[PDB]
Structure formats: structure tokens, C-alpha cells
Design a protein around this ligand. Structure first.
Ligand SMILES: [Cl-]
Ligand SMILES: [Cl-]
Lengths: 318, 318
């Protein structure tokens, strides 16, 4: 009496004839983006579906006009019912509603509807359609991702990071000169403060990111100024949000020595690095029921990072 | 002995004549937003200054044309020098540069410049001007906030919060129905997941928030559904950013009882509240040197908040 759970929820309605089809984003997390439905007197006649990855297929043989539903990013099912044709030989009707308040109802036109089969839409995120068809839709179901516990982008790599040439803009913070006209040493304390706004973002298809809160477990590109010049490093792995911004007052206290009968110019700056480079990773979806769906992904990472505050001191005679 | 530090940095250059003036944001964190400078042969003739709170005053008596600098929000000084008029009786010249690459130089037109006095601009955030004036600018300095360790909005209150009538939008998550044709109750499990995006923002003058990272120590308005309806509460105090957004997968697992000979409709929803209400607080600036500047402030809070997921069931015979 062991029990198996799955990351998808699929209930197929209709008859036993025709040829099998499966048209879903189980491979890559694509969702149903658009659907056209044709009907006949005693069946759903045909269905054409588009997934968010651009796939486009037709099942059954269209006749007459079609009805359309176009899903916008983030627009999930809230409810779905299917009917057979009452004879156990075809799909008869499709009714659904969405979280944007849309409704869609397509049905056979001669025979009345009998038993309604209301479906659990899981998370509401529809991965596509599975069934059998020939001339008509013999049977079909809508496949949903089950309710999710977590959605994580992990195993993140930046394949070009070690080829990247640092682009670092100088931001001026402050400059001041000191004078020592005596023949003794002087010291001057200089304190510095500067707001820095650090950002990270990993690109993802908007339909997926609109529906799910994606946690990122990744290192990010980092910038420092070192001996020969600027250096880019692949930082240590930590938890981020998909788009993240943090701000801080970065500060420094510097003691400048002023040697006798000399002028000392103090120049205080910081470097601002932009990052714009591709990444690879794995999307791991863990469902409430304990099952997992995962797939490889790629995108673009954009980040802003700052160096440490830098103090440059130049001596003159005077 | 003891050592005294101050939250402001001000070095006044010129002579001892004229009447004292003080035109600064010490009281309220206002910054120098615009300056006009008139010159004569042996003096800075007059200065008109605008602060970011709308204050506008003129010191000295204008003659001839003026030079202008207008500071955009976040544009801080990087450097400043002042000159007397050589005789030690008037201010003679003003030179500054900004973190946006601007430079301004106004000087007396006949007598030559002598000793340059380079200034420490502290944080770079200029609170205003202080000096003495009559016909001319006898002496003047630019007042700066010293380098900052932290800037915090605290003691936050929402004075209208207990008057507010909850306005809460329903977001549909999922609905499904079950039917029980038997003489014994049945149990259906339903899992729910729903992305929510929660936000907080406390308005502040853009010159200040562009220059300083303002941490917020505050409770926020919260929304909940109670037996009697929706309820707004003043949440517990915690750390926030001045503008904050967080996303989360809200989830729930529910056992639905289907009584004998009944159909049960299950409707799962969440409530979204959009707060837009005034706040009062205290801004506390702690400088690197240990001194503090604080003042009362007021503004508008905006935030999106959600209730818990709600499950509603309705029974019908059949
Ligand atoms: Cl049937
Ligand atoms: Cl002088």
C-alpha cells in the first residue's frame, strides 16, 4: 500500500479510440499559452495548442470556426471541468476559469452534456494537454503542475566569467589638500561615506516567474581592485531573490600623514562595476506532495557591484 | 582631555564685519538645492540660496549678473575651496566640484586671489551656508553633514491606521467541487500554492534618500480576515529598507469533508490590501565620528499586504 505522488496532475476524459498524443512542458516548464478549440455535434472536433516555448501542434481534424483562449503571463487556471460526449466515445466539452477572471466554455453542439468532471488544477499552472485523437478528440486532459512548496534556481554557472574584461566606472567621493609649513610631521584624519546600491538579476520566462516565487541559490560575480588592476571573481554561493537590490552606506576612516614643508592631495573614489553575462542553471521545483520536477535552464545575469573605497595620496613640496 | 565631535562640518572664511546669518538644513535634513553668486571687484557681493525644503534667502546686496549652480538630487560636493579677498575683510572666491562632474568657480574680479582654503566636505551632503553679510558677503562657509555611519527612520506611527476601513481585493486561487452519492462522509485533500508580492515604502525627500541608505525600524500595516470581516493591525517593529519588495509562495493543505448525499463546492482565495496612508517618524543620523543629528519627519506609506489563504465550502443536497 505504498503510495506514489507526481509533480503533475492529469485527468483524461473521453473514449478509448484514436492515437495517443502528449503536448506538454514537462521537459522545460513551458505552459499552455494559447488554445483553439473546434467542435462538432457530438464531440470536441480538434484542439490546437501553443506552449510558451513556441511549440504549436494540432490534434484532431478542424472543421468550422474555432474558439480561442489566450493566456497572459501569470494567468493560471482557477478551475476546470471536462465532459465526455455522454456515450463514452469522445471528449464533449471543456470549461475553465482563470485567475484573471476569464472564462472559456467549448462544447459539442447537438448532444446535451451529461456527467461533469471537475478537476483539481494543482498550482493552476497548465503544462499542456495529453490525450488521443484521430478525426476528432477521442479523449483529453489538461496537465497541471501540482501545488508547489518551493521553486529554486540552483547549480548556477557563469561560463564566460573568466573571459570577461572588467568594466569599472570611477565615482568621485571627495578630494582635499593639506599643508604642513612647519618642519615637523602632521596627521589628518579623513572620514568617508558613500551610498552603494548592489543589484542581481537572473532572467527567466515571465510566465514562470510571474507564477512562482523563484529563490536563487548561487554565487554572483564580484569586483575588486588589486595590484595589476581590476579583478572579477565568482563569489561564494548564497540565497538570493530572482531580482535583488541591496543598499548600504559604505564608510572608511583614513589617517593621512603630512610630511614637513609639503602639500598632500587626498583623492577618494570608488569603482562601480556592471555585469551583464550569461548563466546556466537548474530549475528545481519541489511540490507540496514531495515530488520534484527539474530541468536545465539558461539566461542572462545582470549585476551592479562596487569596489572598496580607494584613497590615493600625492605629495608635493611647499 | 575630552574630545568633542559634531554632526556638521563648517569652516567660515572672510572678515569680521556684517550681520550674522545661518541658512541650513540642520533642523530638518534639508540640503542646498540651488545657489546664485554675485561678485564685485574685491568681494563676493551676495549669495542667494535655496534649500530642498523650499526655503529661499539672499545675503548681501546683489549687483551685476549672477552665476548659478543647481544641484540635482543625490548630487553631493566632492571638493570645496574658499578664498578671502586677501585683505581679510570679505569672502573673495568660491570653488567646488560635485560627484556628477560639475564645477563652479565664482570670484572677485579686480583684486587677485591669495590663500586657498581647501575644505573637508564630510559626507558631501551640504546643509547650507553660514556667515555674515551687509552690503557684501563679509564671511561665509558651507555647512556639511559629516561622514555618516547610519541613517535610520524610527519611531514610526500611522496616525490614521485605526480609522481606516479595510479595502481588500479577492484573488481567486482555485475552485473545485466534489459529490458524495453514498450514505457515508468522504475526505478529499486539496493542496494550494499562490505567489504573493508584499511591499513597503516610506516616502522621503529624494535629495536625502539618493545620498544616504535609509534603514527603517518600523511596524507595518497588516491585513487579516476575522469572523467579523477584514481587520487592519499595526504589525510588530522590525528592520526594513525604505523601499522593499519580497515574494513568497504561500501554501496550504486542506482536508475537505464531503457529507453523505451532498455536493460540496470548494473555493480557495486570498485577500490583497493596498495601504496608502500617512506616517510620522524620526530620522536619526549617526556620524562616523559618533555625533548624531535627528529630526521629526512625516510622509506617506504605501504597501501591499495579503491575508492568509482562505478556504470556503458550500454544501448542496445531491
Ligand atoms: Cl462520456
Ligand atoms: Cl583674506
Amino acid at each position: 500500500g505504498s503510495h506514489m505522488t507526481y509533480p503533475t496532475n492529469l485527468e483524461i476524459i473521453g473514449g478509448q479510440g484514436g492515437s495517443s498524443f502528449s503536448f506538454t512542458g514537462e521537459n522545460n516548464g513551458a505552459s499552455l499559452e494559447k488554445i483553439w478549440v473546434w467542435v462538432g455535434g457530438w464531440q470536441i472536433k480538434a484542439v490546437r495548442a501553443w506552449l510558451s516555448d513556441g511549440r504549436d501542434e494540432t490534434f484532431g481534424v478542424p472543421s468550422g470556426s474555432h474558439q480561442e483562449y489566450v493566456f497572459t503571463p501569470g494567468e493560471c487556471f482557477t478551475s476546470l471541468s471536462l465532459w465526455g460526449n455522454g456515450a463514452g466515445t469522445r471528449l464533449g466539452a471543456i470549461k475553465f476559469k482563470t485567475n484573471k477572471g476569464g472564462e472559456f466554455f467549448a462544447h459539442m453542439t447537438s448532444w446535451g452534456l451529461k456527467t461533469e468532471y471537475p478537476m483539481d488544477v494543482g498550482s493552476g499552472y497548465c503544462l499542456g494537454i495529453v490525450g488521443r485523437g484521430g478525426s476528432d478528440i477521442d479523449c483529453m486532459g489538461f496537465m497541471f503542475l501540482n501545488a508547489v512548496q518551493s521553486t529554486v534556481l540552483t547549480n548556477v554557472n557563469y561560463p564566460t566569467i573568466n573571459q570577461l574584461i572588467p568594466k569599472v566606472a570611477t565615482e568621485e567621493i571627495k578630494s582635499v589638500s593639506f599643508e604642513n609649513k612647519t618642519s615637523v610631521k602632521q596627521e589628518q584624519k579623513v572620514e568617508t561615506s558613500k551610498k552603494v546600491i548592489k543589484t542581481s538579476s537572473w532572467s527567466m520566462t515571465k510566465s514562470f516567474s510571474s507564477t512562482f516565487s523563484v529563490e536563487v541559490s548561487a554565487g554572483i560575480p564580484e569586483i575588486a581592485e588589486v595590484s595589476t588592476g581590476f579583478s572579477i571573481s565568482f563569489g561564494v554561493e548564497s540565497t538570493h531573490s530572482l531580482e535583488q537590490t541591496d543598499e548600504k552606506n559604505e564608510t572608511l576612516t583614513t589617517t593621512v600623514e603630512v610630511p614637513p614643508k609639503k602639500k598632500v592631495d587626498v583623492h577618494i573614489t570608488i569603482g562601480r562595476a556592471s555585469f551583464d553575462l550569461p548563466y546556466t542553471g537548474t530549475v528545481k521545483i519541489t511540490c507540496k506532495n514531495g515530488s520534484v520536477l527539474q530541468y536545465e535552464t539558461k539566461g542572462q545575469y545582470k549585476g551592479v557591484a562596487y569596489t572598496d573605497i580607494k584613497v590615493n595620496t600625492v605629495e608635493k613640496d611647499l
